[PDB]
Design a protein around this ligand. Structure first.
Ligand SMILES: CCCCCCCCCCCCCCCCCCCC(=O)O[C@H](COC(=O)CCCCCCCCCCCCCC)COP(=O)(O)OCCN
Lengths: 85, 75
């Protein structure tokens, strides 16, 4: 059976949060790195100096670390994920 | 011309920008701080010039006393 919840949010006025912490895993973005507004960074993500992440990209570090190095770019609609092993 | 106020204001503005750059921030990140820095630099440069004048004035008297003490030898 599919039993819905009356309280589930249909429209969230805040939109999707760009920075999704996961416990103590907080995405780290360098002050001189460009991250597009609608990008999602979750968990163990590090974005270093001079790098850029463009519109619609998703970087989900919930199983392992994700690192974008110096002056590197992850372009539009890329998905970057990782596994335990 | 090139007054102490202008040199000091330029140095204060440069100080704020250099500080922003060192922190990898945009040059004009907090512009009111640039205004504050220009004011402080102008004040500091003017005060330094006045202090230099006063320092030369005191050194003059002190060298005068040293010279008198030395000249007392040939009496
Ligand atoms: C006359 C031009 C220069 C006047 C400067 C202000 C008057 C002099 C008073 C001393 C000013 C010293 C510098 C103040 C800022 C120092 C560094 C503070 C930065 C900081 O980390 O804490 C912030 C507090 O904001 C702050 O500390 C700033 C709070 C509000 C001050 C900004 C308004 C300045 C008015 C300039 C002219 C206005 C014209 C109309 C009168 C929080 O940062 P945050 O979260 O708030 O955001 C920041 C977005 N990166």
């Amino acid at each position: 059976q599919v039993t819905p919840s009356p309280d589930r949010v249909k429209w969230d006025y805040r939109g999707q949060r760009q920075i999704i912490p996961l416990g103590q895993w907080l995405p780290k973005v360098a002050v001189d790195a460009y991250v597009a507004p609608n990008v999602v960074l979750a968990g163990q993500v590090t974005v270093w100096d001079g790098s850029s992440v463009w519109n619609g990209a998703v970087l989900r570090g919930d199983l392992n670390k994700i690192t974008v190095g110096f002056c590197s770019n992850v372009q539009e609609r890329c998905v970057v994920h990782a596994a335990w092993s | 011309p090139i007054s102490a106020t202008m040199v000091g204001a330029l140095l204060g503005l440069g100080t704020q920008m250099y500080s922003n750059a060192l922190r990898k921030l945009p040059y004009m990140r907090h512009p009111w701080e640039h205004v504050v820095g220009m004011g402080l630099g102008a004040v500091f440069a003017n005060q330094l010039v006045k202090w230099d004048v006063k320092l030369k004035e005191d050194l003059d008297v002190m060298l005068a006393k040293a010279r008198a003490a030395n000249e007392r030898r040939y009496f």
